[PDB]
C-alpha cells in the first residue's frame, strides 16, 4: 500500500532548466507531488509562525515545530543565509529549513543568494519564493536571484495568480 513514485511534478511553467514554476498552494502541492525536499521559509530561531513555516507547521499538526525545538537543542539558532534538513513530515521525506533574509526585519538581501545557495544540496526541491510574501523582498526579485543562483532543480510554488501571470509576461 505504501510505496508511491516521489517527485511527481506536474503543471509548471519551465523557466530555465533549473527552475521552474506554479501558481499553487505550496501544502497542497506536496500532497499531490510526493516530493523527496520540501523547503521551509524559516527564521533563524525555527519558530513556525507566519507565512509558508506555519502553513507547513500546521499541516504537520505540530510535529515540525517539536522537531525543530530538538534541532535548536541540539545546535543553536541558525544564522541567515544558512539551513538544516530534517523530518519532512507528512509533507515530504525530508525538509530544507532556509532563513532568507527578512526585509521587514531590516536584514540585507544581498543574503538571499546564500540562502538560495542551500538549495545546491539537493537534487530537487519544491520551494518557495524566498525572503518573499511576508518577509518583504520583492517576489520577482527573489525568483531573478533563484535562477541566477540554483544550479539543480526547483519547483516554486507561488500562491498569488496575479504575480504568476507577471512571471508568464516576463517570460513571455
Given at each position: 500500500h505504501h510505496h508511491m513514485p516521489v517527485n511527481?511534478?506536474?503543471g509548471y511553467l519551465k523557466l530555465t532548466d533549473n527552475v521552474a514554476i506554479k501558481c499553487v498552494d505550496i501544502v497542497k502541492e506536496a500532497q499531490s507531488a510526493n516530493p523527496m525536499v520540501i523547503v521551509n521559509a524559516a527564521n533563524i530561531h525555527l519558530?513556525?509562525?507566519?507565512g509558508v513555516a506555519g502553513a507547513l507547521n500546521k499541516a504537520t499538526n505540530g510535529a515540525m515545530q517539536k522537531e525543530s525545538d530538538d534541532y535548536i537543542k541540539l545546535n543553536g539558532p541558525l544564522t541567515v543565509g544558512g539551513s538544516c534538513l530534517l523530518s519532512g513530515h507528512n509533507?515530504?521525506?525530508?525538509?530544507?529549513?532556509v532563513v532568507g533574509p527578512n526585509l521587514n526585519a531590516g536584514?540585507?538581501?544581498?543574503?538571499l543568494k546564500a540562502a538560495y545557495e542551500n538549495?545546491?544540496?539537493?537534487?530537487?526541491l519544491l520551494a518557495p519564493?524566498?525572503?518573499?510574501g511576508i518577509f518583504g523582498a520583492k517576489p520577482l526579485q527573489s525568483l531573478q536571484v533563484c535562477v541566477q543562483t540554483v544550479r539543480t532543480q526547483v519547483y516554486i510554488a507561488v500562491n498569488d495568480k496575479a504575480l504568476y501571470e507577471q512571471v508568464v509576461m516576463d517570460y513571455l
Open positions: 511527481q511534478f506536474t519558530k513556525h509562525g507566519g509533507l515530504a521525506k525530508k525538509c530544507l529549513h536584514e540585507d538581501i544581498q543574503l538549495f545546491n544540496s539537493q537534487d530537487i519564493l524566498l525572503s518573499a
